[PDB]
Amino acid sequence: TDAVLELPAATFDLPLSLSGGTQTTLRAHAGHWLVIYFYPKDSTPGCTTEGLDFNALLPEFDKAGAKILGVSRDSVKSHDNFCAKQGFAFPLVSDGDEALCRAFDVIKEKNMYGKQVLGIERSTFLLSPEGQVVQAWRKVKVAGHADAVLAALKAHAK
Ligand SMILES: [Cl-]
Ligand code: NA
Ligand code: NA
């Protein structure tokens, strides 16, 4: 009923490779809120702006007991370099095979260049403590986004 998106059961058990060399799974986050933001490419202007915006708000996400994960299909090493350069204090998922991206349906197609071109569409999701996707943002406008996600989280968590 409150879900806005249904994920395959297996999604919650996918091993997600993180910056720093460990793995997580969505099921491992049971009991707390989780913000999952998808972005197209490490170390590009919009993606850097977005990551820095979330990073600045971490204490506010902490107040709600929430954790954040950023996701792109860049490698672990790329993610390590991006985190270190920018000072991010939350993890980045290296979704190299786009398994997590496909589960959230963020790989979108555009007819361009006389081709059918597939890519990550900037998108964010709020996952409840019981693993329901209760809010989505797609074709994300970076400016103001992290603030809006925090506000929505607070509204849902209260
Ligand atoms: Cl959705
Ligand atoms: Na960088
Ligand atoms: Na969760």
Instruction: List, as one string, the DSSP characters of the chain.
Output: ---SB---GGGGG--EEBTTS-EE-SGGGTTS-EEEEE-S-TTSHHHHHHHHHHHHTHHHHHHTT-EEEEEES--HHHHHHHHHHHT--S-EEE-TT-HHHHHTT-EEEEEETTEEEEEEPPEEEEE-TTS-EEEEEES--STTHHHHHHHHHHHHH-
Record the tokens describing residue 71, joined without a space. Answer: 């996701």
For residue 55, how far is its CA from the centre of ligand 2 (angstroms)? 14
Neighbours of ion ligand 2 (CB under 5 A): 43, 82, 85
Record the tokens describing residue 127, joined without a space. Answer: 């996952």
Q: In Å, how far are 106, 111, 117, 158 from 114, measured between CA atoms?
A: 22, 7, 9, 48
**Domain coordinates of the chain in residue numbers?**
1-158
| Number of residues written out for the chain | 158
Q: Among all ligands shown, which has an atom nearest to the Cα of 12? A: 3
Partners of residue 61 on adjacent β-strands: none
Q: Among all ligands shown, which has an atom nearest to the Cα of 7? A: 1
Record the tokens describing residue 117, joined without a space. Answer: 């071109």
Q: How far apart are CA 49 and CA 140, in angstroms?
A: 12
Strands 92-94 and 67-72: parallel
Query: Experimentally, how was this structure solved?
Result: X-ray
Resolution (A): 1.1
Architecture category of domain 1-158 in CATH: 3-Layer(aba) Sandwich (3.40)
Task: Indicate which residues carry an active-site annotation.
Answer: 47
